[PDB]
Structures are given as structure tokens and as C-alpha cells.
Amino acid sequence: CWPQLRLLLWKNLTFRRRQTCQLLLEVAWPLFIFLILISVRLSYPPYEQHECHFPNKAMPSAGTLPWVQGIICNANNPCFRYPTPGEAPGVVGNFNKSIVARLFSDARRLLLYSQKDTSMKDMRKVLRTLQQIKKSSSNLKLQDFLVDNETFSGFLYHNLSLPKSTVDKMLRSKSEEMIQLGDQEVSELCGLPREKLAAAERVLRSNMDILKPILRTLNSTSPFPSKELAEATKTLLHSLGTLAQELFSMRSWSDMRQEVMFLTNVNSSSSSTQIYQAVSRIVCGHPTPYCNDLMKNLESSPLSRIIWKALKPLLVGKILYTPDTPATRQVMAEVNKTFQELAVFHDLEGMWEELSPKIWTFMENSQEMDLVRMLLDSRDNDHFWEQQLDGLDWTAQDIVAFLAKHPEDVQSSNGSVYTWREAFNETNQAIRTISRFMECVNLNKLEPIATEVWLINKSMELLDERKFWAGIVFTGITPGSIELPHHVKYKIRMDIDNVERTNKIKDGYWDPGPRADPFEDMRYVWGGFAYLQDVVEQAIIRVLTGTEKKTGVYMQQMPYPCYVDDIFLRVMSRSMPLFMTLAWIYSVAVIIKGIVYEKEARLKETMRIMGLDNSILWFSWFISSLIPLLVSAGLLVVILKLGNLLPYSDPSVVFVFLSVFAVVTILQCFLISTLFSRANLAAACGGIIYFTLYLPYVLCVAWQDYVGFTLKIFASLLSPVAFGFGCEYFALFEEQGFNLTTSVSMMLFDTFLYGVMTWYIEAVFNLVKVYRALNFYEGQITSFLGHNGAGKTTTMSILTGLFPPTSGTAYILGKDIRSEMSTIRQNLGVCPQHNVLFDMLTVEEHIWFYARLKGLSEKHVKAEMEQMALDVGLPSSKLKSKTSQLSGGMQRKLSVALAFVGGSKVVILDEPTAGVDPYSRRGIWELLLKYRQGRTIILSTHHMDEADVLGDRIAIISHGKLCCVGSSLFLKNQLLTLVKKDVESSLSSCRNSSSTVSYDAGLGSDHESDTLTIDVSAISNLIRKHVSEARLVEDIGHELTYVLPYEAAKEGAFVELFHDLGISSYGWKLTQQQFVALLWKRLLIARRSRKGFFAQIVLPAVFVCIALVFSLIVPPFGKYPSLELQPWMYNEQYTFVSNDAPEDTGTLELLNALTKDPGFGTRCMEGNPIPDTPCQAGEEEWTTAPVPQTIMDLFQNGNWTMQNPSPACQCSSDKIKKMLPVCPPGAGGLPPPQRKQNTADILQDLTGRNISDYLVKTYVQIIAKSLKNKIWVNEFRYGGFSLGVSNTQALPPSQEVNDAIKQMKKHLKLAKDSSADRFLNSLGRFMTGLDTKNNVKVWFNNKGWHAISSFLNVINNAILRANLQKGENPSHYGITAFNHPLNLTKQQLSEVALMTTSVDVLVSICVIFAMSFVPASFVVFLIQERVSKAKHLQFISGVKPVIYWLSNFVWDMCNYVVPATLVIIIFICFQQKSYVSSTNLPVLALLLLLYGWSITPLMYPASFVFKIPSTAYVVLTSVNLFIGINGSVATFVLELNNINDILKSVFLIFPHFCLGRGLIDMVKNQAMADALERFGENRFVSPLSWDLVGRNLFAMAVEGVVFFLITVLIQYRFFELTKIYRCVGIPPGECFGLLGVNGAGKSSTFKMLTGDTTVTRGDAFLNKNSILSNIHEVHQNMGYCPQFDAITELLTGREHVEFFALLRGVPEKEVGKVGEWAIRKLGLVKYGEKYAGNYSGGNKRKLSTAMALIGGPPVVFLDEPTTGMDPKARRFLWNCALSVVKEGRSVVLTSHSMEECEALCTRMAIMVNGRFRCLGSVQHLKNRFIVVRIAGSNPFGLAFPGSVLKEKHRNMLQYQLPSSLSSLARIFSILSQSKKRLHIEDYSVSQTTLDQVFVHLKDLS
Ligand SMILES: *[C@@H]1O[C@H](CO)[C@@H](O[C@@H]2O[C@H](CO)[C@@H](O[C@@H]3O[C@H](CO[C@@H]4O[C@H](CO)[C@@H](O)[C@H](O)[C@@H]4O)[C@@H](O)[C@H](O[C@@H]4O[C@H](CO)[C@@H](O)[C@H](O)[C@@H]4O)[C@@H]3O)[C@H](O)[C@H]2NC(C)=O)[C@H](O)[C@H]1NC(C)=O
Ligand SMILES: *[C@@H]1O[C@H](CO)[C@@H](O[C@@H]2O[C@H](CO)[C@@H](O)[C@H](O)[C@H]2NC(C)=O)[C@H](O)[C@H]1NC(C)=O
């Protein structure tokens, strides 16, 4: 059973080997698509991130300095990769390292020491114990003051204008030379050297004078003198000891200048990172016209963008507010306090107005500071002051301390300057810059407002004025100073570009990621919603309760674990079966074209005739379908692993799984294959049912509702969803390497169910035969000619088909057919009517395929190929031309040749001669003639003359039983004349049978020879007009004893005969009436097509409905507003509470109220948030989880794991492989810690855990747990919060700081002015703006959009439930906080108008699909009118085709009116895009109806030449879609040259006609949307729907479409019968007929001649039926008929008749029922007119000749007048023609069967090369050159009564054109032709113009 399947695969594979284009599109299409998609991979490489950890933000209840470092420091959120110590349990601050923090730390140290210092006033009492007792030690360089008892030379000596010594007579040249050096050498050591170098040049006058000054000894020996000074100066030296230690030890402004001074002094000074590198070291660690110019430069400077977006809502902006009741004014007072804790900088200029000269002179002329300069340097102060100063710290020096202390001027310029004269203008510059910068921060930013609509309007104006922070709408009650109602809302309205967009509360489609893009998506805490949240919350609390601050609240993000993003891998492998489907859309289309292609030409059924069963067919297509698909799948595997697309899953099972899906897409291709009846309708419709085979997967990716066995329920029915789900299994087990067994199971069971649908859909759409019974004998040509019984085709088709018993007939066997159901079926071939061509295999391979397919192949059929080649007759031309379509004419010779190939036991052929006349009996009767000697060959037929040429026997079934049997001689002498005897013996008159053992006057002398011949030789004389068929009554032999009767006329007396023997020899208003007649016909085909195509009305309306119902769902984009609450507000989660630093200060008080009866959130003795619905179910006692046996693993984690790390590792992301998250090996952060389910959450009390590594690891394992299951999982928790205590390691608390400002203020000129009062009080509040007694810290997750605000509301809620004194519950306090953004501006409403416009461009492309899909209906009815029926037929009758195209076009408008109106009712019954208004209706509707007016002309010149039916539907839908999407890009100009192309689109669509409705439709809805919103809140412009902007271009062009209609009809305007031209005169009485083969163009010149161009193109031009000048007379009255059956494909029979009469007669009243005198005349009114439409079979040609009958022509034409008219309608329809031309109409004729035409004709017609000039009757043409077949293959009347007296057996004589006849019986026909023959030649003048003696019965001209 192999080689029939090997050759059968030779058929299937050879079908593709002989094409070489569908194989290359086939195997090259997935190459192209998968390489393009693999390019879309290799454009986007994988994106990797380390394990991101995040800094903590700060919030202004913490302190003003930590959060302004929170703004300047970390805008970027920089992913530190290692936990920044804010993410530790205890330590929070993150900014020890900030040197700005050490500055105000030093402010606290200097103030808190100056609270406890007595130094300068003890210096004052040193001075007063020097002012009173010592009484003079005011001592400068020049002179010495001393007023005492002169303990050590108490005197004076003046370095003055002259040398004066006030102890004796000084008396000086040397005077000014002495004191000029003396004030120069006025030093501690140069007092002695001045008198020394002087005393070298002076005398012992400088010995007593120097003797007093040595006893003076420069203010150090004098300090020894009194004892009361000594203790007081000891307190001086100790006081300057500790002040020296502190004032050096502060160290900060020293290092501040020693970082800022390098950058802006050096020569190049160019920018780098180094400016904000060094500034980033200043504020953090290692890891008005000048105002406006400055803010422009700060937006200009790079690496300062995001901090400018963040600082702009701090320093410029302005905030506002609602109802101002004085209690609520306390709220605004206290938020104003939290801003004016930054306001210590306005007064700072106020110091340098006031304190500056006091300092400048105190450091110049205070004698107290002179003593500080005195004791600052001495030898006793070297040991003492450098003992305490050397032990102070690593100080500058005592000499350097002396340097920066007290000058008189500069000492030297070049050496080293580090001094206060430098420093005083250093700090003076500093306060200038800080003054002018901090004169740009409007810290008066509050504006109370009574009505919130003024707040929104003023809000809009201020927003356009560049400065707007939030606006806090309250819900305060009345102007009544009951403080707050115990439960406040508030409503922080901000604009859209800062507060997060409040439409969606989660990420949407969850991709992984940390979501920390700092500009795009951190948007609460640079735009600064949250800052309003914290400040305003702490304000409300401080009103309601009374406690002062005692909380900071930081913001830490939860860290995110080292992910990757491969969104192309993810959405690609999630959406695999689209681009897997595409290559097999092409493959499915090719294989389904194969199946129904050979179903069309009936190769399956003739293959079943060849003795096969359907198993081998369907299996063969299964295999050879499978192989190119399978190699495409293997090529996907090679492009799939090696192309870097899917690692981690082993490359074998992708090939196995694609092999399975290849199998099941094949069986779904057979399932969609067995239902179609035409080649290319299937070959384009199959891929679209492969889309709709696919789409429930895309329709099932989101809804999700089919989780359980509903996957099996929608998988047993559907194959590609079962592939998509298994590929979801690939995508889930894709990055780390329900189930796939479900996928292969539903695939395999889906295939088996598809095969049950294949068979169960297949069944739903010597050689005797004894069954009454006969015996088809040895034969050598049998025949069965019975049409009175309609089961003769069922007799042969039952004799060899799939029925051993009969079908409603005698169920019995013949020659034991069931006993040899493969043997006798393997013996006797057949040849069906449907010509088995195997359309493009090869000629010798058609012979080889039918031969080997029969059997005896490898040896015998090789030899039989040559003998088969001895039957056709073109061996090398079969080799050169092998394609069966390439041959022609003798195709039926290859049919019967293919049947008679091999060993033909009983070749039961049927109808072998339906072809060309000179090859019909020549070809088929030549092959049946020469191949006759083998065995019996039955042959049914329709034309009977070939059966008369056939030569063993005949049969005539009466009603299922043979009314005769025996050869044609036996029916001849028992009853041409046999063809007439196929009716008179077709009834039940008489039956005869002789079933014997099958085991020209010279014809008158031959007639008398037959008279003298029948006696000696027993013979029955029979001359059939050309050949003396000498029958004989002989049982055996005598073929040589009878040759003497042939010897009497042995001149070519050939025995062309057969067998016991038988010998043979050779010897107007009617215009508009036709207009409404055509419209009537269209009304008929419309109204009668119920099952007919209402799909062209249902389809556009329903796809408008799927567009609009798709449009009801989409997000509106204009609802950035909402009114949210801010609880946790998410569905299921659980938070966590870390009670860190458990030393029960106030944190115990906090957690004590965060987990008690008011609970975690916002309700208050009522369920206030609306879906929260309290539902307190959950115990009050801590209950952990059960643990598997790894707590010994935890005990041996107590070995070697402490809090430094405390899990194992994680399966970290790698360099060449990657992982989406990253897994733990064991249990990361391992024990499940304590639980407490309270209100829809179970807050897991971490306590002292390592919180960051817990969050990373346990987030990993809960995601990777619930991702294998793939519930497409959201997030597990959204925000926790540690509690805490930050240490009190700072100086003793805030009240002592304030008291230090108290007595610091009381000392040193206590003042109440504008400057020093406000500066000192503001410094007091600023310094109390840094203490954080505790601090909670919020750990939010950021993946929820609204977490950051929300837990902040939860915590500030908790502080409110904490601090209250002893109320009767903390239950009904509490605070919510509604985010609610602000109405949009011009630009934002405009931009969302643009987006909503694009979302409606979707509706443009779908309604342009539907009204793109209407006109193809009108096209395909025009193809059904152009295909050989009534374009030509109705164009024959004089119509002037302007009215024809205007008829069809006016209808197509009128039929366009209905479904477009239905679409108008669709989205006017909907409420989108068109409404009640007068700018919605007209520009829609007139555009639609006028849009049908637009398209419907332009489809007609696309429908002249489209030479294939019922596919312009498809391809015009395609090209019209490409016009639409060309529209979509043609105004996607938003993603003056742009106005040159996009405003050139109006001139581009000025001649373009189908884009205009789309894009002008989008101008319509853009205009109504834009004016809707914009006059919806603002001023008015003109509503311009019907204006010249959008719509008038559409009305201009598409109302210009009538020019395209003129292009259509103008495109069509370019497109008896006496033929005696440049002589065949067809007169008005004859019956002509075209029977010639020497010419070919007479038929094209006939349909041309019956048509417009009456003469032949490229030939003689003359007057033969001229139809040009007097048109609609000659060629238009003359009825014709095409070669096919012009049948009005589904119109009606009766209305086809009466309509065809109505369009031409102008007899409309009598043309109402002229079809009774025509349809009743044609004999087709019962079974042809009531059963209206496709009246089957032979009645169609009767209706065609009927449609040419009613014309009433002057000359008729009927070519191919019969093709299935075997029973009666050949000579009966020919009898109707005989009535036509016999009534005086002079018909024409053309036939592929010269017998039945030649019997009825009267004159032949044939053209050699010029005109026809063929004028001959049948007996004359036979007399010169049956006889009609032999001649067609090789190259007054009263004397009938005289013969009726001569021939005494006077029979009848049917008339003729010129001729007569004689039907006398052959009883004694001796003298019947003897005396009439010798008299026929004797009295041939009686037959003068007849001029013939032409030849039981006879006929004679
Ligand atoms: C909770 O659990 C987490 C688990 O991650 C702990 O996080 C650990 O925190 C440590 C903080 O000190 C991290 O150590 C850092 O490691 C960096 C990486 O350099 C390593 O170098 C060694 C040898 O040189 C190699 O073996 C490693 O493979 C790395 O190459 C160090 O650079 C870093 O040192 C710091 O650098 C900065 C910047 O230069 C300096 O400013 C600073 O002074 C210091 O020198 C530091 O040592 C550790 O990676 C991290 N993870 C793990 C798995 O240990 C938390 O600490 C736990 N919580 C508590 C409260 O302990
Ligand atoms: C901002 O938009 C809102 C809603 O679109 C407007 O709120 C309206 O308030 C008035 C007060 O009675 C009523 O018309 C409606 O309750 C609200 N909606 C509408 C559509 O009017 C608010 O007035 C707008 N403000 C501005 C300045 O446009």
C-alpha cells in the first residue's frame, strides 16, 4: 500500500515543484518576519540595575535644616547599591558628614557656652582694678601711663614729637631722631635695643633713662606688682584658655572657607563637575532684576535642573486657603510658623547695619581688647597661655593667635595674611550675598479666601503668573470658633504638572521596576504635595491638642532587588502566536488552495473512481502539508535559540511543541477547508477565518475569567488559544532556567475533534450486470442510450461507484462486483465527464500517474508508456510541452487515452465526444476504434450519431429497463432514423432484441443489384446515403462468398466495417421605460436575495458597532480630576511596625495608640471611607506562622549570622544569563514574624530585624511564589513604617537654648528694635527647629502611585491619636486628606483635546473600513453582470450605454442610502461623535450619503478589467484600507514646512476622494471637542462644522466625483446577414449556419457582427449589417447568445424572460405577457419560470435561446444551442428554431456538433480568408464534397405527386428549403428506386432548380 502513497506524495509534492514561487514565499516569509522581529530585539538590549537602596527624604516636621538638605542633596534618588544608614534600625540622620550641619552645631555650642561665661566682665573688673588702684596702665606704643607708689619705676616716657623722658631733665636732632626710632622700636624687646643702638651714638643720659625702662619691662613685670590683679588676671588667663579652646575648636567656618575659596579665584576657573562636586561636599558627604537673571541662570546651569524644579515650589510659589474662621486662622498661623523657622535670614543684614561698627571699633579701640592683645602674648603666657592653648587642641599657634587678633595695620603684605581685616569683609561679602539671595523668597505666602470658586479662578490666574504652590480647601463648618469639628478633611488642590495624576491608583500592566525616576514619577515630593501634607497635618494636630512638636517624619523608600527589564522579551513571548500565526497564515492559505483546488476540478472524486479511499487522500495531504510547515518550524528553532531570543528552555521542546501546533493548524485547515466551493474564494477567505480562529486569545488576555476548566471549555473548541497558553508557560519559565501538559492535551484532543469534524463534515456536504438486467458482452464497442429513464448515469455510476447495491433501484449485483471490490475495481478503469487532467503535473507524468496509480508500474507501465505514446501522436512534443493546460483540443484524447492505459478489462467510458468536430469522432472514435480488439468497452453518450458510428450494440432504457437491444442494423430493419427512433421506441410500444453470441444513379444500378442480390446471398440491403452497409442474414462467415456484390462496383468498395458479420462500402419614452426596466431588474435581484447578500448590510453596521462599543470603554483623558481619599486605599496587603530603640520614652506611647481600637487608619465611630467597610475580624493576640524544619537552620544561623547580615545570599543576576527578579536559595530574612490582622491587613511586627534585607528578600520570595502560579500578581505590601528614637546627644535641651537667648539678649545692649529683637528671637526659634525627640520614619513602596501621601496621612493620624489628653476615646478624632487636582489651562485642555481626537481617529479607521466595505457589493454584482451575461447581452439590444451606467449608478446610490442611514441611526442611538446639535448632524450625514456618491463611480473603472469573479470584494477592501491608513499617517502630523506638508494635504486630497471622509471626519470631531471644552469654560469662537476648514474640502472633492463618473462612462465609450464584402447572401427565408474549420475569426466577427464593431478589426471594412448611422436597428434587434449560458445568475426565469423582452420591445403592455407567447412557446414555463433563478441543467440553454427568441429579430443567432439536450430538446429546441426560421426569420447557427445542426439547417457557412461565400445545402455539399461529418471532417414542386403515382407506396414528404423527401418503407423497394431512379435521371428536369437525386426511409432533393 506504499507506492500509491509514494506516487500520491509525488502528486502533492510535484504540485509545488512545478510552481517555484509559493514554495519560496512559503519558506522565505518566516525568514523575513522573524529576522525583522529579531532586529526589533537587537535594537533594545537588556536593561540591568543593581540592588537599589534609597536615601531618606526629610519632611518639615523633622526640622528645617534636614529637609532643605533633603531638597538640595538628593533630588536624583541615586540607588546607592549598599544600604545608606538611614535604612538601619536606629540611626536616621544621614548627615553627620554635612559641614553645614556642623555650623549650626557650633551655633549651639557658642550660644550655650555664652550662657555660662564671665570672661569679658571679669576683664572689666581687671580694668577697674587697673583704673582705680593702679590708676594708669593705658599704654600704647608711644608713652607709658603709671599712677601709683612707683613699685617698679612708675613714671612716664614719651615717644612723641620730641624725645621726652618724664623722670628728669630730658633735653632732647637727637630728639626726633630718638623718639622717631622710639615709636618705631616700640616693642616688648625693642625698648632696650632702642636705647642700646641709640646709646652707641648717645651717652649715659640713656643709662638712667634705660634704667627706668628696664624696670618697666613692657607690661609683664608690671603684672606682678599687685596681688588683686594677679587672681583676676588668673581668671583672665583661664577664661581665655577655655574661650581659646572653644573658638578654635569650632573648626567649621575655617573649613568652610577652606573649601569655598579655591574655585572662584584661579585664572581659568572653568566649569566642571567640580563646582557642584565641592558644593555637594559642602551640603552633603562624598556619596529683583538680579533675582530674575539669577533664576534664569539657575534654570540654565546643568546638573541643577531637578533641584530647580524642586526648589521653585519652595521659594517663589504662593499658597492659598479656604474658610477663614479664626480657629482656622490658627491653622494658617501655625503653618506660617513652620515656614518662618526658615526666616532667620531677613534680619541678617539687620545685624550688619547695627553690630558692625561696634565690632569694628571694639576690635580697634576697646581697651578691654587691648588687654586681650596684651595677655595674648607673654612668656608667662607662653608657659601658661601656651600650656592651656597647647592643651586646648591642635591650634594654629600662640603666635598665629596673636596674628589674627589685633593689628594696627597690615604688618607685611606679601608673607602670610590670615586675619580679621581679611575676615571682616569676607563675612561682609557673605551677608551681602545671603541678603540679596534671601530677598527672593516670599515667605509671606498665605492668602485666606472666603469662597473656593474665587480660589480656583484666582488659582488659575496665579498659575498663569508662574507662581503657585498648593491650595488647601478645607471643609470647615461655619464662621464659629469652636476649634475644629474633631474630624477634619482637607483638599490639597494643586495643578496637574506637580501632583500625581489621580485617575489610576496602580501601575496598570505590572512590569517590574523600582519606579524611582525622579522627575517623571517621584512627583509628590519634588512638586511638593507631601510637604503640604506634613506641615499642614502637624498644624492641625497642634491646634487640636496642644503639644508642641515631639515628632519628625522621614520618608524612606523600600529598596528594590537588583532586577532586569526585558519588556521586549516579556510582551514578545506573551504575544508569540501572532507572529507565529503570520507565516502560517500564508501556509494555511496555500494548503487550503490546494485542497479546494483539486476539489473544484473533481480530482478527489475521480481519484475515488481510481479505487482509493479517503484515508490515503487526507493522509497524503496531511503529510505533504506537514513537511514545509515542519521545516519552517525548525527554522524558527534555529532563529529562536541562536538568534538570542529564548534561552533557559531547551531547544528541543520548542521544536516538538511547534510540531504539535503545526499538526493542529493543519487539521483546523482541513476543518475550514471542507466547506468551500471555489478556488480563490477559499484561498483568500481561509486566512481571515484563521484570524478569527486566532482572536479569542487576545480577547482572553485581559478579562481573565476563564481560570479553571473554562480553559478546557474554550480550549477543546479552539486550537490557537491552546498554543498561546502553553507559550505563556514558556514566558513564565522563560527567565529562570495550567502547565504545558494542558497545552499539548488540548492540542491533541482538539486535533482529534477536528478530524471527527472532518469526516462528519465530509458526509454532510462476458461482463454482465443483473439488476432490473442485461449482459454487456465481449462487445468491442458497447453503448447505452437511454434518457427516458433518468438513472442511466446512475446505472453506470452505480456500476462502478461506491454502491454495490442500487440507490432506490434494483439492488442486485453484476459479475460479482462485491466479491471483487478491489479486484474487479482493480481491473476495469473508467473516464468521467469531469476531465481528470491533474492540471499542471506533466503529460508523460499524467500517463505515468494514472498508469502507476492503476498498478503494474515499475516494469509493465514503462513499456506501456510507449504504446500509450502510439495513441496520442506527439511524443517529443509531449516531452517539450508537458503541462496539461499547455496542450489543448486533444485533451479528451488524453482523457480516454489515460482511461485505456493499462490492462483495460471493462473500460466504461461515458460521453467521449463533447469536443471539437474534426477531432470528436476522429479522436475518440479513432482511439475507441483501434483499441477495440482488447476487451469490452461500454460507452454512454448524449449525441446519438457517434453511437451509430459505434459498432456492436445499443440500448434504450424505458423507465429503468431496456426497451431495445442489439445493433443499429437490427433496430434499423426492426423499425439518423435511429436518432428519430430514440423517441418512438423510448416509450412502451414494442421491444426487440437479438442477443447473439459475442464469443448517384450508380446507386440505382446498385439498388437493382440489391434486388438481384438478396436471393443468392442472404443479405438485407441498407445504403445510408454514403456507404452501402451490406447487412446479411448469416450465422457464420461468407465474407469471401459475398465479395461479388462488391466486385460489381469494386472501385474503392472498401470493407470499412466489422462483425455473424455486416459489410460496408465507400462507393424616446421607451428609453426611460428601459431605464426603469433595468432598475426593476435590480429591484428583483435585491428583493429576492434574502439568503443572498444582506451580509453587505449586516457587516458594516456591526463593525461600526464594534468600533463604537470599543469607544465607550477607553479612558477619557480629561479626568485628571477625581476626589480621592487617602487611606491605604488598596485592596489586600499588610504593613509593618518596627518599634525600634525599645526604651519606652514616647515611642511606646505612639505604638500603644497605633495598634489599639481606633486602629491603623481613619474611621471614627462610623465607617467614613466608602469602600473600607470596617469589618473588624481578626484576633488581638500575636500569632506567628508555622515553620518547616529550618529553625535548626536558624539556630545555626545563630551560628555566624548576627544583624550584620542575616539571611543567606540571593541567586544574583549574572553576566551572560539574567533573571527578572533574583531568587533566594533557602529563606531570605527567614522566620515568619508575628502577625495581627486588624482591618483588611495583618501588620507584621518586625522588631529589631534587619529591616532592609527582610524587605528585599521576602518581597522576592512572595513575588516569585505568586508568579509561578501566574495570577499576574500585584504587590504584597505598599508601605510600612519604623518608629524610633533619635538620640539626645546634642546639647541640653531647647528651653536652655531659648534661655541662652534670654540672658544673651539681656547682656550686651538689650534692645527691642526691628533688627536685634527679631534676629535674636528668630535665632531662638531656628535653633529650636533642629531637635527631634523621637522620629518615626515611613517606609513606603512606590509601585502604588498614591502610597507616599497615604501612609503619611496614616502616621499623622496616629500622632493625633497619641498626643491628646485623656479624652473619652481616641476613636472619633482623626484626619483624612483628599487629593483633588486643579482645572486645566489652555495648553492642557488643548493637549487632551488632541489625545481624545487621536482616540477617535480609531473610529475614523473603522468607519472608513465599513463604508470602505459597502461599494464592493456593487462591484461584485457588476462582475456577475460582466461575465458573459448582460453587459454583453443587454449591450446587444440598443441601449446607448450612458443609460446603462446611469441605471446601475442611480441604483447604487439608492442602495447606498439604506446601510449608511443605518450607521447614522447606530451612533445617533449611541451618544458619541454625533448628538442633537446642528453641528453634529449635517456634516456627518451629507458626508456619508455624498460619500457613497464619492466612491461608487471610482469603483467602476476598477471593474471593467478585473477578470476573476467575487474577489474584488477582497482586494478592493484591501486597497481601500490602505487608502484609509494612508489617511491616518496623513494627519498624524503631531508626533512652516510641517504646515507645508500637512496643509499640502488639503491640495493632495483635493483630487483624492476616499481619504477625505476620514481626515475631514477627524477635523469634525476635533472641532466639536475643542469648542466643547474651550467654550465649556471660556470665551466664544465660531462653531465651524460646515465651514471651509474641514468639511468643504470633502464636499468640494467628493461633490467633484461626478467627473470620475464621467471618467467611468467615458472609459466605457472607448469600448438577413448577406455577407458579400470586399458573396454569401443570407436571404430572409433561409436557415443558415456557421459550419467551418478552415477559418477561425468568423465567430469573433459574429459576436463582433452582432455587436457594435460589425466588421473584423484589422480586416475588410464594408457594408455587412451596418449598425453605426441608423443604430439600434440591425445588430441590436438581432438576438444572439454567448457560448456560455447567460442565465441572470439569481434573478428569475419568468422575470428573466419578461425583463429581456421588456428592455428591447417597446411593447410594454403586450410586453407584460409576451413571455407567455415566448416562454410557453419555448416549452419552458412549468419547471423553468416558477422555480425562479438557477433552473438546473439543460433548461438553462432553453432559457437562453428563449431570451434570444423574444427579440423578434430580422436575423437570429444561436451558437452552442444545445449541450445537455439529449432526450428531446435537441430536435425539440432545434424544432423551435425550425419554427423560427420557417416562420420567416432567417436565423443563423453555430455548433460544435454538425449532426444535430446539419439536420435542421438549410445552408452552410464557412470563411476561408476573405468573406464567407459558402452557399450550399446539405445534399448539395455532400453531393460535391454521416455525410455531414465526412465532408466536415475531410474538407413547381408538383412532381412529387408523379413519383407518388410511380412509387405506389406513396408515403409523406416533409418539406425543406429547396428540397423534398420520401419516407417510403422498405417492404418491396425494388421498383421503388428503380423506376424512380431511371426516371430520376430521365426526368431530372422535373427537379430542375433542386437539381439533385439525394439519399426504412430516405430523402431526396
Ligand atoms: C542588613 O543587611 C544588609 C545586607 O546587605 C547589610 O548591608 C551591608 O552593609 C554594609 C555596610 O558597611 C555593606 O558593606 C559595604 O561594602 C562595600 C563594597 O565593597 C566590598 O569590599 C569587600 C572587600 O573590600 C568585598 O569583599 C565586597 O565584595 C565588596 O567589594 C564597601 O565599599 C563599603 O565600604 C564603605 O565604602 C564607602 C564608600 O567608599 C565609605 O564611605 C565607607 O566608609 C565604607 O568604607 C561597605 O563596607 C555591605 O555590602 C552590605 N551587604 C552585605 C551583604 O553585607 C546591612 O548592614 C544590614 N543592617 C545592619 C544594621 O547591619
Ligand atoms: C473647575 O471644574 C469644576 C468641574 O469641572 C467646576 O466645578 C463646577 O462647580 C459649579 C458650581 O455649582 C457647578 O457647575 C458644578 O458643580 C461643577 N461642574 C461643572 C461642569 O460646572 C469649577 O467651577 C471649574 N472652575 C473653573 C474656574 O473653571
Ligand SMILES: *[C@@H]1O[C@H](CO)[C@@H](O)[C@H](O)[C@H]1NC(C)=O
Ligand atoms: C554622628 O557622629 C558621632 C561621632 O561622635 C556618632 O557617635 C553618632 O552616632 C553619629 N550620628 C549619626 C546620626 O550618624
Ligand SMILES: *[C@@H]1O[C@H](CO)[C@@H](O)[C@H](O)[C@H]1NC(C)=O
Ligand atoms: C575689605 O577687605 C579687603 C580684603 O582684601 C581689603 O582689601 C579692603 O581694604 C577692605 N575694605 C574696607 C573698607 O575695609
Ligand SMILES: *[C@@H]1O[C@H](CO)[C@@H](O)[C@H](O)[C@H]1NC(C)=O
Ligand atoms: C507669616 O510669616 C511671615 C514670615 O515668613 C511674617 O512676616 C508674617 O507677618 C506672618 N503672618 C501671619 C498672619 O502670621
Ligand SMILES: *[C@@H]1O[C@H](CO)[C@@H](O)[C@H](O)[C@H]1NC(C)=O
Ligand atoms: C473668573 O475669571 C474670569 C477671567 O478669567 C473673570 O472674568 C470672572 O469674573 C471670574 N469669576 C469669578 C467668580 O471670580
